[PDB]
């Protein structure tokens, strides 16, 4: 199916003392594979997946130098935006950046992304055509005017259509034994009486990859949303994900309810029933 590479950068100023904190993480699909943390000892981009470790020292040197330079750009930008917003230098503020590319099942470019935030709100974003910008406010509009004059979109686009897709393909092949295998959800249901007359059925999905999944409850074959609850999909910590959905039912009527599990690793949706 389709695949994605994404990088997430967070820069947080530290007005009491010293340089902003800068954290960068890189993902292929739902697998982290690199990180940089300005507070760490290496001062280097570091591997976080086994299949990236085979890259040679020229890879790590280049990636370290590019991410450090970007971190210094974020430093300058925190000062610039403080001025645009007329903010005091007493306060801590945050810039966030997400960017990357998707390839389709053919391994060819599908879509590119570049989006920036300030203090958790949209600031400026590259549009889907990779030729225009959306600025959320008048401060971002200044940036947009500067980036148009600098032809920033063209530089962003060349990366997203070029090196981004080229190295995504390389990672997917080098990491294929995990990156291109699906782990279907391991499912089961639990029963919890809450009274002499009611019970909670909880439908569990465990150990799946990728994280995208749909859990739905049906009563007598009809989608049921009343008296249900769904938790946010969460990481297990071993690279897989977990989720559950629950329903309150009249005791003795459990057999009417079915949990339906949809996932990329499932040729057919799974149906579970407390029998």
């Amino acid at each position: 199916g389709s695949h994605s590479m994404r990088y997430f950068y967070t820069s947080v100023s530290r007005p009491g003392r010293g340089e902003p904190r800068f954290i960068a993480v890189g993902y292929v699909d739902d697998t982290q594979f690199v990180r940089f943390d300005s507070d760490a000892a290496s001062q280097r981009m570091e591997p976080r997946a086994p299949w990236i470790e085979q890259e040679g020292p020229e890879y790590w040197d280049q990636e370290t130098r590019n991410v450090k330079a970007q971190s210094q750009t974020d430093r300058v930008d925190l000062g610039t935006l403080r001025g645009y917003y007329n903010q005091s230098e007493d306060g801590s503020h945050t810039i966030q950046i997400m960017y990357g590319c998707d390839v389709g099942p053919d391994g060819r470019f599908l879509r590119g992304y570049r989006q920036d935030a300030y203090d958790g709100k949209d600031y400026i974003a590259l549009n889907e055509d990779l030729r225009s910008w959306t600025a959320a406010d008048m401060a971002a509009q200044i940036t947009k005017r500067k980036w148009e004059a600098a032809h920033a979109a063209e530089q962003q686009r060349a990366y997203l259509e070029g090196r981004c897709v080229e190295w995504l393909r390389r990672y997917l092949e080098n990491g294929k034994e995990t990156l291109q295998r699906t782990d279907p959800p391991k499912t089961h249901m639990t029963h919890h009486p809450i009274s002499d007359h009611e019970a909670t059925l909880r439908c569990w999905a465990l150990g799946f990859y990728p994280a995208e999944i749909t859990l739905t409850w049906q009563r007598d074959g009809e989608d049921q949303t009343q008296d249900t609850e769904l938790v946010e999909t969460r990481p297990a910590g071993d690279g897989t994900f977990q989720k559950w959905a629950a329903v309150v039912v009249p005791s003795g009527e459990e057999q009417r309810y079915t949990c339906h599990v949809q996932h990329e690793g499932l040729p057919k949706p799974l149906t579970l029933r407390w029998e």
Partner: peptide, 9 residues
């Protein structure tokens, strides 16, 4: 790989 260093805001 990461993108290159960009234009300042």
């Amino acid at each position: 790989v990461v993108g290159a260093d960009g234009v300042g805001k």
